[PDB]
Write a protein that binds this ligand. Structure first.
Ligand SMILES: [Cl-]
Ligand code: NA
Ligand code: NA
Ligand code: NA
Lengths: 148, 148, 148
């Protein structure tokens, strides 16, 4: 017989939220900001993308994003596709990703039950240009290849 | 025997054109702006990309973009490749895409003569950052996988 | 038997460096600016990406970028994968790429020892929006598909 391959692509952006002092109003103290895991998000998007399932939005807060990834792993099995490989590009002026990347790979390879060598995570910069260069936020691109 | 797979990638950007009142000059009324379907454009690019055909520019105005997509469908057949699947990411702060996405999928699946499940369209935002966050325009990323 | 496919994705950005007159300080003349091949860079990233090898950074200045591409060609052989095809999107408001693209394709197809038709290079614009629209720099997206 023959086999089937499918590509997904996720893209996500996270805006940094500056922490600023809590304020009192009408005598009550309100902590504020002025959550989302950008990579796992783009990754879920890529996988549902490859499957013609739309995005994470079609299927669904403060729960560890790892959970969602685990639900996507199940949806993946029900559709009877496997991961061939995953490639990730984190785009950030900062923080510095390099120290944490292998941890990310092990973490996700585990949840997804593939080999570390089947999921690549690299980080680049915009060279201080655009909203990412000004450190207003970060983005990630994910591509996945699925097989049956 | 064996089979062949090929990846394309399109990327397109559309700048919004503000509608502003018509002006008279030298006594003649001139309507102005201060056309392109961004998705079908990136999509054509991805397909010609996968085939080593360059871009839509290598092969060619106000004609419905669906037409071009139909010519790309023919070029695809002459090269004897088929679509495995297509993944699309629309990047926009607005308008709101969600209501129109299924229409897009049906429309394009039809022209391309594949299953709706073979073409995925998702929409994300830049979270109000960069030119897209300021609503100056929109972009789309397309990836396609082709087989023989 | 069966075969294996793998996707890579590279993304690179280059900031233009304005040439401005040399300055003298403490009586010594210092030439300054206020190097990297963006495409070959994203391309290497895509290939190492597909292989679960991280990025060019994991494996390594003023040497012709073609060299690095040639080392990536060797790493590719040691892992025993082949290029199915490569798709490149150069994002620039300028300079004008169109005249130089075929040269790029021949150059890289040669080093990589594949057919010109196996590597596609297209160029688009941001329509004068964002850092690329303001001509502050350029980016490239590469996707590659590898087989065994
Ligand atoms: Cl900007
Ligand atoms: Na799809
Ligand atoms: Na190609
Ligand atoms: Na990989």
């Amino acid at each position: 017989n023959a086999m089937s391959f499918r590509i997904g692509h996720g893209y996500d952006v996270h805006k940094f939220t500056s922490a600023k002092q809590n304020i009192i109003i009408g005598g009550v103290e309100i902590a504020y900001h002025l959550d989302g895991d950008v990579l796992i998000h783009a990754l879920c998007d890529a996988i549902l993308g490859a499957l013609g399932l739309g995005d994470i939005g079609k299927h669904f807060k403060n729960i560890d994003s790892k959970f969602f990834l685990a639900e996507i792993k199940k949806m993946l099995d029900k559709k009877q596709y496997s991961i061939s490989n995953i490639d990730c590009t984190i785009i950030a002026q900062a923080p510095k990703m390099l120290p944490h990347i292998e941890k990310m790979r092990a973490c996700l390879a585990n949840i997804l039950e593939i080999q570390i060598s089947q999921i690549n995570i690299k980080a680049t910069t915009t060279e201080r240009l655009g909203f990412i260069g000004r450190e207003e936020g970060i983005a990630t691109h994910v591509v996945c290849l699925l097989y049956r």
